[PDB]
Amino acid sequence: PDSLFAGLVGEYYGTNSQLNNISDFRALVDSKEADATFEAANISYGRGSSDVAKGTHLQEFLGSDASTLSTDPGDNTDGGIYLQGYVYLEAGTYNFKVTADDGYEITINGNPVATVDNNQSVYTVTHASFTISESGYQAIDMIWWDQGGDYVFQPTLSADGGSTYFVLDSAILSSTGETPYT
Ligand SMILES: CO[C@H]1O[C@H](CO)[C@@H](O)[C@H](O)[C@H]1O
Ligand SMILES: [Ca+2]
Ligand SMILES: [Ca+2]
Ligand SMILES: [Ca+2]
Ligand SMILES: [Ca+2]
Numbered sequence: 474p475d476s477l478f479a480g481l482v483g484e485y486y487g488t489n490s491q492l493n494n495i496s497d498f499r500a501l502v503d504s505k506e507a508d509a510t511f512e513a514a515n516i517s518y519g520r521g522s523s524d525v526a527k528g529t530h531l532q533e534f535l536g537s538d539a540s541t542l543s544t545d546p547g548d549n550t551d552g553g554i555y556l557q558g559y560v561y562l563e564a565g566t567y568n569f570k571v572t573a574d575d576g577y578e579i580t581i582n583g584n585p586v587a588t589v590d591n592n593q594s595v596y597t598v599t600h601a602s603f604t605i606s607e608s609g610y611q612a613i614d615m616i617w618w619d620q621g622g623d624y625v626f627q628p629t630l631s632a633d634g635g636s637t638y639f640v641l642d643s644a645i646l647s648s649t650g651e652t653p654y655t
């Protein structure tokens with residue numbers, strides 16, 4: 474049975490190879506078991522320095538979510554996270570605005586809705602709008618990585634045409650698509 478919690482299922486992967494793009498990180502995820510798992514209940518991570526994959530930097534980056542880590546990974550040069558689960562959204566129009574170092578991809582109901590397919594120092598992109606056709610728990614997944622140096626990841630979402638944005642957190646996240654009461 475899968476744990477029901479108000480968050481996404483988190484997996485962390487580290488590597489001593491260079492992560493240059495989304496393909497490289499997804500290949501890392503498919504290559505092995507997660508180096509750690511966690512509950513992603515407050516998806517606003519970092520900012521920090523001196524490589525996410527070194528020392529306790531992952532714990533610092535994950536902050537409020539670090540207390541759910543399954544283990545303390547050893548050192549790597551490069552690393553990233555894969556989050557998957559569900560997000561409660563009412564039918565309507567939305568767009569992401571993401572602050573990140575390095576890149577990332579977010580999908581909703583299997584369709585990319587926010588993509589940065591390269592390394593970058595901290596940058597904020599306002600992404601194109603997408604529609605939700607039916608109110609309820611939408612499938613969501615995210616990948617983010619750090620090739621080294623600084624690291625930050627804060628996807629925010631707007632329901633009102635970019636006037637206000639919110640962090641994805643325990644108010645609307647579900648690990649399985651059932652209603653969490655945690
Ligand atoms: C040179 O380092 C800078 O740029 C790279 C991307 O090239 C980022 O990954 C890193 O965090 C940032 O500090
Ligand atoms: Ca895997
Ligand atoms: Ca460590
Ligand atoms: Ca924090
Ligand atoms: Ca905590």
Ligand SMILES: [Ca+2]
Pocket residue numbers: 593594
């Ligand atoms: Ca730069």
Ligand SMILES: [Ca+2]
Pocket residue numbers: 490491492550551620621
């Ligand atoms: Ca690297």
Ligand SMILES: [Ca+2]
Pocket residue numbers: 574575593619620621622623624
């Ligand atoms: Ca970096």
Ligand SMILES: [Ca+2]
Pocket residue numbers: 635636637638
């Ligand atoms: Ca505003």
